[PDB]
Design a protein that fits this description.
Order of helices and strands of chain A: EHEEEEEHHEEHEHHEEEEEE
Strand content of chain A: 25-35%
Structural class of chain B: alpha+beta
PDB class: hydrolase
Largest interface: B-E, 45 and 53 residues
Protein name (chain C): Type I-F anti-CRISPR protein
InterPro entries (chain A): CRISPR-assoc_prot_Csy2 (IPR013398)
Number of helices of chain A: 6
Oligomer: part of a larger assembly
Organism (chain C): Pseudomonas phage PaMx73
Largest sheet of chain A: 6 strands, antiparallel
Radius of gyration of chain B: 23 Å
Number of helices of chain B: 7
Chains: A alpha+beta, B alpha+beta, C alpha+beta, D mainly alpha
Number of strands of chain A: 15
Largest sheet of chain B: 7 strands, antiparallel
Helix content of chain A: 10-25%
Number of domains of chain B: 2
Distance between the termini of chain B: 19 Å
Structural class of chain A: alpha+beta
Number of domains of chain A: 2
Pfam families (chain A): Cas_Csy2
Shape of chain B: globular
Number of strands of chain B: 17
Radius of gyration of chain A: 21 Å
Order of helices and strands of chain B: EEEEHEEEHHEEHEEEHEEEEHHE
C-alpha cells in the first residue's frame, strides 16, 4: 500500500521462544504474518498516541537457532519440547508439539503520518522501542539487552531525501547496520512463472507442485543438481476463506464478540532470503497486509519489491 | 607344481646415506673434515616463455602479451663459495649380505627353491662380477650425477671402517676410471673382494665414500631435488626445492643407490649407450625407455620365474642381472 | 532382507562427485543432498600440505569415484549408513503399502 | 554477486569479535585486509589508526578479491582466447565495482 | 615417420656463477684480490604519486589529498664506498661441451637424428662463430648490465684456469669492443678458440672473468633484484630487495648467462637494434616483443623441426642460432 515517509529501524531484537511452526506445511523461521501483526500491535499500542502510522515491516534475521534435534539413524529432525504441568489427577498431559526458536531479527518499519513533524525522530524511535521491549514477536519474549557492551539504539530514517545521492547514502548507512542477516521478501511472480514453465513441461500442474519444485533439490540425469536463483523458501503468505463471514455475536467461543469471525486456511507462497544490499532501496522489502475481505484472501506480501 | 609366492619383499643390500656435499679447495682435500657445507639458498629467477606453442597461442599479439607478463619464480640454488673450487660429497655405504633371503614370503616351498637357486649361483660364481661393478660405480664418482659432467678432476676416497677407524683406505681417479668400461685393476679388485665378502655375509663392510670434484669457484653444484607444495601465488612460487638434511645440501640416499646400481651392461639393446641401473623391466627415466621389456624374455620376472620355478637357468650375464635385482630389493609379487 | 544396493540408493545422496580436469573426485555431503549449492553442507577436509578439497581420489570415471565413495561410506561412516538403512526400510514398507 | 555477498556478510559478522584484534602483535597478518575486517580499532586509537582508514578509504581489497576469484576459472587457453574471458572479466569487474563501492563508504 | 620427441631436456652449457660485486680504486686493480665487497644496505625512500591517473582520480581535491599522504618504502641499495671509484664483478664460467646430446629424450631415433644433425653442423662449421660471439660478450662487459652504461673505463680480465692456476691471461677494453659489432681481434680469436675447444668437448675450459667498471666515488652499483613476499605493512614495505650471497652484492647467474647469449644478430627484424639473447621465439623482456615469431619461419622450434625431422637445413645463420639454443639448454618438447 502507501509509501513510507520515514523508515524506522528496530535493531537486533532477541526473541527466545518464537513459533518455529510457521504453518501446517512449513517450519523454521516464523511467518511474516507474525511480524506484520506485531507491527500492527505496535501501531495499536503506541502509534495512535504519537500520531503516526506504523505500516509495513522488513524482516532481517541476523541469528536463528531452532530448538530441534536430529534423531539417531534418522535423516529428518524433531522438536525439543517443554514439560507442561500435570492434570488434576496427577498424570502427564498429552504432548502438543510446538516448535521454539531463538531469533535475532531487526525490523524496518514504515512510518508515515503527521507525528513525524510534531515529535523528534529519536523520541518516537525510543518510544516504539520501549513499547516493543514489553511485547512478543512470534510467541516469544523480546530479550531487552541488559548489561552487554552497549545497547543497540534505533534510527528513524526519513525516506524523504533532499538529493538522490544523500538518499542512496543513508540507505547504505542503514544497510550496513542491518548487514549480518538476510532480508525476507516474497517472490510470487517467480512462483507463478515457475508454474507456467512446469505447465509447458507437463499439463495440469498445481502451484503447490511448483512451490514444492522450488523447494526440492532436484537431481538431473546427464549427474548434476538443478541450480536455483536464490534461497527460495516456502512461506505461508496469508489465509483463504473456508466459511462465509459470521456476525460478531453469532459464532461460538470467539476471541471477542465484536469482530466478524471467518474460518480460514493457509495460503503457502514463495519467499526468498536475500541480503539487504541486493535490493538497492530499503523502502521496498516491507511486508504489508492485503485483505479483500469480500472474497476471503487475507494475505501479506511485500509489494513494490521489483 | 611350484607356483610363484604371492608376496616377495627383499630388503635392500648396499644401503647408502644422504650424501652430504661440502666445499673447499683442492690440495687441502686431506684436511677436509672441517670443510663448510654447501648451503641451499634461494634466488629469484625470471624468464620469458620458451616452451612450444600448440597453434592456438602463436598469435603474435598474444605472444607479445604473453612475454609482457612473465613468470616470476624463486628457486633453491646451491653453489660453491667464491673461494672454493672442490665439492666434497661424503656418504657411508653399508654392504649387508644375505641377498637371496626375502623379508616376506608366503610360499615356503618357493622360499626354499629360491634360496637354493641363489646359493647355487653363489657356489658356482660368487658376488665377484657384481662387486667389481659396484666397486667401479664407487670408484668412478657416478653418484656425483651432474657434479661430475664438467669437473676438471674427480678423486674418490673410499675407507673401509672397522671397529672405529679406517681398516683399509682406497684413493681413486674417477675420470681415468670411466663411466662405461668395467676394466680390471689392482685396487678395484681389492675393493671388489671387500664388497664381495660383504655381500656373502663373510664380514661387516661399512665403507665411507668421499668424492672431491674440481668444479670451479662459485659454480653450481647439484643436490637432489624435492617436490613442491604449490598453494599460493605464482610469483612466490618456489619452482625448485633442493634437498638438505640440516642447513647443508645433500643428495638423496636412493639417488646414490641408483648410481651405484648402474652395472647392467647386459640388456638386449646396444652396448654403445653403456650400463643402466638394475631395475625390473630395466628402465632409465631420462630416456623414457624400458629396456628388458617383458615381450622379450629378459626382464627380471620371466628370468627369475624361469630360473626358480622351471629351472631354465639363464646366461651368466642375465643371472648376474637377476642377483643384482635381489641385492637391489623390491616388492616382487602379484595380488 | 533389505539388500545393499537399496541402501546405496539413499546413501548416494550423501556423496558429491566434483569434476576436475583430470577426472572425477568424489566427496561427502553431510546434509545429504549431493552437494547442493544452498542446502548442501559439503564435508571439506584438511590434508597434508594445504589440501582443502573433497576427501576422495581423482578417479578416471564417475562409476569408480562413486564406487569408492560408497565403499568409504560403508567402511567408516556408519551413521549415514544407518540413515540410508532406515530410508530403505521405509521405502520397502511404502511399496508394501502403496 | 553471491560470492561478493558472502564476503560482505563475512566482514559484517566478524565485527562481533572484539574491537581490537589487529592490535594483537604479529608480522604477517594481512595488514591491508585488516583495515577492512576490524573498523573498531578507530574507537581505541583515536588519531593513530582512525585517520589511516578514512583518508586512504581502504578499498583495494576488491583487486585482491578478484585475484582470488580468478582461481575459480580453469587454466584453459580455449577459455582464454575466446570472448568468454572478456565477458567474464567484464561482469566480474562489474560486481567488483559494486563490492568496492560498498567498501568505499564504510565511514558514515 | 620421425616425429619430434615429447621430451627434450638440454643441459645448460656455458654455466656461469653468481657474479660477486666488490669495490676499490682504479690503478690498484692488480692487487684487487682483497678488495672489500659491495654491501647491500637499506635506506628509506619517500615519493609522491607520479603514475598516470585513470580519469576518475584526476580531481584536484582528490589529487591533493593523494599527495598529502606520501608513500614510504625502504629499498635495498648497493653503492660504492665513498673512497672507491671502481666496481669489480668477478664470476667464473664453465664452457662444457656436448651440446647436441639431450639430457632427456623419449624418441631414440629422433635423438640419433638430432645428434647426426649437430655432428653435421660441427663438422661443416664448428663452434667458431658462436664462440667468437661468446668471447665478445665476455670481452665487452655486457654482463655488467647497468653498471656499464655510464662507466668511464671498463676493463675485462679473463684467465684460463688450468690445474690450479692461470694457463692463459686476457685483458680487454670493454668499451672499445662494442655492444653491437662482432669484429675480429687477435686476442679475441684466441679466446674464441678456447671457448670453441670447450664447446667441442676437446678440452676442459674454466674461465675466471673479472670486470672493473670505473663508475665513480660512491656511486650506485646495480646488483640483481629479488622478489618480495609483501606480507607486511605499507610503511616498512621493503619495495626492493637486492641479491647478495653473503653480505656481498651479486648479479644472478642467469643474468650473466642472458648477457653472454646476446649473440643473435640473425633475427628477421632490423639489425640496427643489434644482438638479442638467444631464446626460442627470440624475445627481449625489456621491449615486450618476440622477434622470431612462429608466424614467420624463424623460431627455434620450426627451424629445428625442419632441420632434424624433414631435413630442410636452414641458412648458416639460422643454424648458428639453433645450435646456440642447444648450447643455451631448455625444456623443449610438447606435453
Amino acid at each position: 500500500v502507501t509509501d513510507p515517509e520515514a523508515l524506522l529501524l528496530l535493531p537486533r531484537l532477541s526473541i527466545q521462544n518464537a513459533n518455529a511452526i510457521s504453518s501446517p506445511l512449513t517450519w523454521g523461521f516464523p511467518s511474516p504474518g507474525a511480524f506484520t501483526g506485531f507491527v500492527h500491535a505496535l501501531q495499536r499500542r503506541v502509534g495512535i498516541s504519537l500520531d503516526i502510522e506504523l505500516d509495513g515491516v522488513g524482516i532481517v534475521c541476523h541469528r536463528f537457532e531452532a530448538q530441534i534435534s536430529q534423531p539417531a539413524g534418522k535423516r529428518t529432525k524433531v522438536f525439543n519440547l517443554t514439560r507442561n504441568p500435570l492434570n488434576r489427577d496427577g498424570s502427564t498431559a498429552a504432548i502438543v508439539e510446538e516448535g521454539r526458536a531463538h531469533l535475532e531479527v531487526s525490523l524496518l518499519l514504515g512510518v508515515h503520518g503527521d507525528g513525524l513533524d510534531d515529535h523528534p525522530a529519536q523520541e518516537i524511535a525510543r518510544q516504539v522501542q520501549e513499547q516493543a521491549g514489553a511485547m512478543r514477536l512470534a510467541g516469544g519474549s523480546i530479550l531487552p539487552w541488559c548489561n552487554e557492551r552497549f545497547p543497540a539504539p534505533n534510527a528513524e530514517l526519513l525516506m524523504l531525501g533532499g538529493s538522490d545521492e544523500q538518499r542512496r547514502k543513508n540507505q547504505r548507512r542503514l544497510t550496513r547496520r542491518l548487514l549480518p542477516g538476510f532480508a525476507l521478501v516474497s517472490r510470487e511472480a517467480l512462483l507463478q512463472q515457475h508454474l507456467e514453465t512446469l505447465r509447458t513441461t507437463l499439463p495440469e500442474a498445481t502451484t503447490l507442485d511448483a512451490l514444492l519444485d522450488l523447494c526440492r533439490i532436484n537431481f538431473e540425469p546427464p549427474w548434476q543438481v538443478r541450480d536455483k536463483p536464490g534461497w527460495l523458501v516456502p512461506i505461508p503468505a496469508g489465509y483463504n476463506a473456508l466459511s462465509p463471514l459470521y456476525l460478531p455475536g453469532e459464532v461460538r467461543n470467539a476471541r471477542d464478540r465484536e469482530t466478524p469471525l471467518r474460518f480460514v486456511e493457509n495460503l503457502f507462497g514463495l519467499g526468498e532470503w536475500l541480503s539487504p544490499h541486493r535490493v538497492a532501496a530499503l523502502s521496498d522489502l516491507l511486508w504489508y497486509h492485503h485483505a479483500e475481505p469480500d472474497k476471503g484472501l487475507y494475505r501479506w506480501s511485500t509489494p513494490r519489491f521489483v | 607344481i611350484l607356483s610363484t609366492a604371492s608376496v616377495l619383499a627383499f630388503e635392500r643390500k648396499l644401503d647408502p646415506s644422504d650424501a652430504l656435499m661440502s666445499a673447499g679447495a683442492w690440495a687441502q682435500r686431506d684436511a677436509s673434515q672441517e670443510w663448510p657445507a654447501v648451503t641451499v639458498r634461494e634466488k629469484s629467477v625470471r624468464g620469458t616463455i620458451s616452451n612450444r606453442l600448440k597453434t592456438k597461442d602463436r598469435d603474435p599479439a598474444k605472444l607479445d602479451a604473453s612475454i609482457q607478463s612473465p613468470n616470476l619464480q624463486t628457486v633453491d640454488v646451491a653453489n660453491l663459495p667464491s673461494d672454493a673450487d672442490t665439492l666434497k660429497v661424503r656418504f657411508t655405504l653399508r654392504v649387508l649380505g644375505g641377498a637371496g633371503t626375502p623379508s616376506a614370503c608366503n610360499d615356503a616351498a618357493y622360499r626354499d627353491k629360491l634360496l637354493q637357486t641363489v646359493a647355487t649361483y653363489v657356489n658356482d660364481q660368487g658376488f665377484a662380477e657384481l662387486a667389481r661393478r659396484y666397486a667401479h660405480n664407487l670408484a668412478n664418482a657416478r653418484f656425483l650425477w651432474r657434479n661430475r659432467v664438467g669437473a676438471e678432476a674427480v678423486e674418490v676416497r673410499i675407507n673401509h671402517i672397522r671397529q672405529g677407524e679406517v681398516a683399509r683406505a682406497w684413493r681413486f681417479d674417477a675420470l681415468a676410471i670411466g663411466l662405461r668400461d668395467f676394466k680390471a685393476d689392482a685396487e678395484l679388485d681389492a675393493l671388489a673382494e671387500l664388497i664381495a665378502s660383504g655381500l656373502s655375509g663373510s664380514g661387516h663392510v661399512l665403507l665411507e665414500v668421499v668424492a672431491f670434484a674440481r668444479i670451479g669457484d662459485g659454480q653450481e653444484v647439484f643436490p637432489s631435488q624435492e617436490l613442491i607444495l604449490d598453494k599460493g601465488d605464482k610469483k612466490g612460487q618456489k619452482s625448485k626445492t633442493l634437498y638438505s638434511v640440516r642447513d647443508a645440501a645433500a643428495i638423496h640416499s636412493q639417488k646414490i643407490g641408483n648410481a651405484l646400481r648402474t652395472i647392467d651392461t647386459w640388456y638386449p639393446d646396444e652396448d654403445g649407450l653403456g650400463p643402466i641401473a638394475v631395475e625390473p623391466y630395466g628402465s632409465v627415466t631420462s630416456q623414457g625407455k624400458a629396456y628388458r621389456q617383458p615381450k622379450q624374455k629378459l626382464d627380471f620376472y620371466t628370468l627369475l620365474d624361469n630360473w626358480v620355478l622351471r629351472d631354465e637357468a639363464p646366461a651368466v650375464e642375465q643371472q648376474h642381472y637377476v642377483i643384482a635385482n635381489l641385492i637391489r630389493g623390491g616388492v616382487f609379487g602379484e595380488a | 532382507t533389505i539388500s545393499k544396493t537399496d541402501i546405496d540408493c539413499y546413501l548416494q545422496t550423501y556423496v558429491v562427485i566434483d569434476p576436475v580436469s583430470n577426472g572425477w573426485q568424489w566427496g561427502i555431503d553431510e546434509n545429504g543432498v549431493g552437494g547442493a549449492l544452498h542446502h548442501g553442507r559439503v564435508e571439506m577436509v584438511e590434508g597434508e600440505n594445504g589440501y582443502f578439497g573433497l576427501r576422495g581420489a581423482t578417479h578416471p570415471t564417475e562409476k569408480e569415484a562413486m564406487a569408492a565413495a560408497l565403499g568409504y561410506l560403508w567402511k567408516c561412516r556408519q551413521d549415514l549408513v544407518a540413515i540410508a538403512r532406515n530410508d530403505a526400510i521405509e521405502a520397502e514398507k511404502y511399496r508394501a503399502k502403496a | 554477486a553471491q560470492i561478493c555477498d558472502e564476503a560482505l556478510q563475512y566482514a559484517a559478522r566478524l565485527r562481533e569479535l572484539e574491537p581490537g584484534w589487529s592490535a594483537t602483535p604479529g608480522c604477517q597478518l594481512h595488514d591491508a585486509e585488516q583495515l577492512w575486517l576490524d573498523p573498531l580499532r578507530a574507537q581505541t586509537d583515536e588519531t593513530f589508526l582512525q585517520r589511516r582508514l578514512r583518508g586512504d578509504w581502504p578499498a583495494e581489497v576488491g583487486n585482491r578479491f578478484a585475484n582470488w576469484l580468478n582461481r575459480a576459472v580453469s587454466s584453459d587457453s580455449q577459455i582464454l582466447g575466446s570472448p568468454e574471458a572478456a565477458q567474464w572479466s567484464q561482469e566480474l569487474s562489474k560486481e567488483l565495482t559494486m563490492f568496492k563501492e560498498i567498501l568505499e563508504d564504510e565511514r558514515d
